[PDB]
Amino acid sequence: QMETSYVSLKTWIEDSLDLFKNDLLPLLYPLFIHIYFDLIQQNKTDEAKEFFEKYRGDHKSEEIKQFESIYTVQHIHENNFAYTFKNSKYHLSMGRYAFDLLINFLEERNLTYILKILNQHLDIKVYVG
DSSP: OHHHHHHHHHHHHHHSOHHHHHHHGGGHHHHHHHHHHHHHHTTOHHHHHHHHHHHGGGOOHHHHHHHTTOOSHHHHHHOHHHHHHHHSOEEEEEEHHHHHHHHHHHHHTTOHHHHHHHHHHEEEEEEOO
């Protein structure tokens, strides 16, 4: 499930070494929106609003308040900042180690939904050296 996986990732990150937390925290924002949009598409407007409200202060307030008013599938279609976000790639940059720790964690815990999001929706530049 989406929300459980978000939390379990969140809890792992917040516990990592500060050296990696920098490269890992940006990951929660696009994942967060993506979970919100996915609950909406499943037509779980209630669940979606609870999830959004709960973790919206974990990370960007200007953009958060743009999404606050987006509850339904129609609202995603009519607001281009929401449509663009859903259908385009969100870019992140990571060091090689943070990346490796991150994928090991998702694969070891079979966080199959978060890996889907990475592959389909995220554009991660892995800095090597």
